[PDB]
Amino acid sequence: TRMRWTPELHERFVDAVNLLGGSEKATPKGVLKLMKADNLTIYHVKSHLQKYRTARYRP
Amino acid sequence: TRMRWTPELHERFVDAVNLLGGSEKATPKGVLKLMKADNLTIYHVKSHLQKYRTARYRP
DNA sequence: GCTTGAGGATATCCGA
DNA sequence: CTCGGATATCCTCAAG
């Protein structure tokens, strides 16, 4: 099994990230708890969030 | 097997990527091929280059 | 049909 | 068990 990130899951994810105060303050366990998605592990979120954090470079 | 990216090995990589017009134009075959380090695959090099091309790491 | 390489997405590993 | 980071594997789509 290899998951992939439909756009609706991505939006749910980014809503969770935003509720936790941004990509930098959010952590996987939080994002997962908020998303409430079946068949989804902390590792799915961990990897996806690492990708998300590397779209913006802050000084 | 798991590689481990030394800092001066990373230098050689940067050196090479710069010989090839930077992170965007540079290619894994090309830069592996320019680095001439032994015990170094194309696969090591593409994973590293993917990390370097991101908006976070390219400066 | 092989055998490659490319970019991007996703998973697995390391050390704290 | 969690986190952040580093590194490898997978997929799709090419080329030769």
Numbering used by the authors:
A (entry chain B), B (entry chain A): 247 to 305
The publication says:
To gain insights into how rice SPX2 reduces the DNA binding ability of PHR2, we determined the structure of the PHR2 MYB domain in complex with P1BS motif at 2.7 Å resolution. It turns out that two MYB molecules are coordinated into the major groove of the imperfect palindromic DNA mainly through helices α3. The P1BS recognition by MYB is mediated by the interaction between the residues K292, S293 and Q296 in MYB and the nucleotides G7, A9, A11, G4′, A6′ and A8′ in P1BS. Electrophoretic mobility shift assay (EMSA) results revealed that alanine substitution of theses residues attenuated the DNA binding ability of PHR2, and the charge reversal mutation of K292 abolished this interaction. The structure of rice MYB/P1BS complex is consistent with classical binding models, and is similar to the reported structure of the Arabidopsis PHR1 (AtPHR1) MYB in complex with P1BS. Superposing the two complex structures using the MYB domains as a reference, the position of SPX2 molecules heavily overlapped with the DNA position in the MYB/DNA complex, indicating that the binding of InsP6-bound SPX2 to PHR2 would produce severe steric clashes and thus preventing DNA binding. It has been previously established that the CC domain of PHRs enables oligomerisation of the transcription factor critical for DNA binding. In line with this, EMSA results showed that the DNA binding ability of PHR2MYB-CC is stronger than PHRMYB.
